[PDB]
Amino acid sequence: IEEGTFLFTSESVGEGHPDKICDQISDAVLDAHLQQDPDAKVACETVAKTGMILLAGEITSRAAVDYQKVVREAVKHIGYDDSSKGFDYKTCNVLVALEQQSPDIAQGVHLDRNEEDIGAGDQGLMFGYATDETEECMPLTIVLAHKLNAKLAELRRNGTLPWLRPDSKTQVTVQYMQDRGAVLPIRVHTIVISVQHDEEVCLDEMRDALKEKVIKAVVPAKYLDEDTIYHLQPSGRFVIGGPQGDAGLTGRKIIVDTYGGWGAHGGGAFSGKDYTKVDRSAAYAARWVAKSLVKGGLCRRVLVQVSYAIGVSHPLSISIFHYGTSQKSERELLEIVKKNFDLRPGVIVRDLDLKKPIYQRTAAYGHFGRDSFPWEVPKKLKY
Template identity: 30%
Template sequence: MIRMSEVVLPGHPDKFCDQVADAIVAECYQADPRAYCQVEMSVWSDQVFLTGGIVTREPLRYALADIVRATGRRIGYAAPNAIVADRYQVHDSVCQRREDPRTWTDHVNDQCISIGWAGYDAKVAWLPPEHYLAHRLGTALAQSCRNGRLTGQGPDGKLLVRLRESTDQWQVEQLLVTIQQLPEIALLELTARVVDDLLETYAQLRINDRRWTATFDDIELLINPNGVLLNGGSDGDNGQTGRKLVVDYYGPRVAIGGGALSGKDLSHIDRAGAYAARHAALHATQTGA
């Protein structure tokens, strides 16, 4: 059976929006442990749009526009990158109210379909192996962009995994990586660094789990197959909160309910239901269901 999965790096415009929305939720909880928050963000070029509602008894410490820019700087939108977060023009339409949020957060005021999934074992974090592999490799590349051999590259990027599963064998067939780069680095040099990061991470997986049967030399590698990618992030595509749900959940072979996780306080049934369903699935799997 052919299995595929995908992850995006922190600088992908959709994931940037998710991170800003979650940073706003965290700021709301700093102001009020019972805070109500439902916020979404969209971005294109240097234009950011915030919508939604916030209810806290105390004011937030930071303006939402400052949270947008700080999040952008943290993930790597700063010089010499093509995107500089401090240049974002933020259009803030979020309704902020100063009153007791428990009117909204002490009960469930919505409905949703929540799907929890767990399988295999702890070696793949109870996830489909292709999705686990995509996350492990994507995390390694993101860390390398922050303080490794890829420092300064990214932060936008995608990684696609294709493997063939049979019984207890996972034969990785192809890894496709597209990653934003600085103009100073040659594409071949970037490719070599990416390959080294992938090799180190995959080799460690094989040491710990013999089900990864393919050697690294067996895997077809495609690194920036369309050529140099300089203007990534919101200069290359528009972004929106909640558009990477398959990445956030279990990969493409597991159905999702459709509710986004980011930008919502923990009283929202989309978020609470997703966590509860995953917890129930883990319990059932780990106890022999």
């Protein structure tokens, strides 16, 4: 029997996954610049590889930044500090290939303009999405996936599971049922967890620990039953992880960073980018809008699209899809959005306080669904 049921799955990766190392390093570099120069123009790409971190991209800033220190301190905090773990901050190669921002981009975007008039730093499309299925207005699949990795990191850093290393991958498969445009998560179907580990600890001590200390502490019992499949350390000997024998890049976990397959994505990455890059600021803005609509009671689920042209301040297009979860028309919801939001980057930066150096926080465990971020605090709407 089936009705209108389906499976959906989302992954998250821990801080030590090579791609997410790059994301966090790029955001550490951005924060370092914003501490001294709030108007810094940053486009930092990081590359992680056996024994190597390379910084490539472009930065115009008044800050004096010691790239060797910021990169190595980041790798330190992530937990790579010895050969035994496959990577050491003290002894890794750090190359830097950073130049100024193209003057052609500067003149065309932000030079000699009032803040509210600065153009989009690029063309692009960005999506925002919210769903009433969790308190945090996010898909349960991605939320559980993130929180599992966060738990592993927690239990690693407070010594309670000292055999854990920084690299990890989780996949949460939830069984869903459609409900008049909304989606009801019914049960957790499958949970996969691969995590990098000590030489000493035996396989089934880890597996016991992943179930009893990680999953039990994270996933409400209401979603777990006797049929739920657990794939804990499925391959077995995952002692080799992180950059060693692997190659990661900034912006190769954009789906993990956002909605875990749900809603939509326009393909712009977040990390290493100041507010003038609308891939970040407009995506943050669009999440804010989507969450505001659902928390404001105007719909149970929603997807928002916005687009920009480089050097132009106002969005080229804005669109709302409520999946038929609102009594009001999508056009009416658009009218409400137009009245309550100003989606130019020069304004978004004020409303969301995006010159603050708090970006490294966002580089793991997802950019959405968390308490402290301005874009997760819904706006009271007037209509």
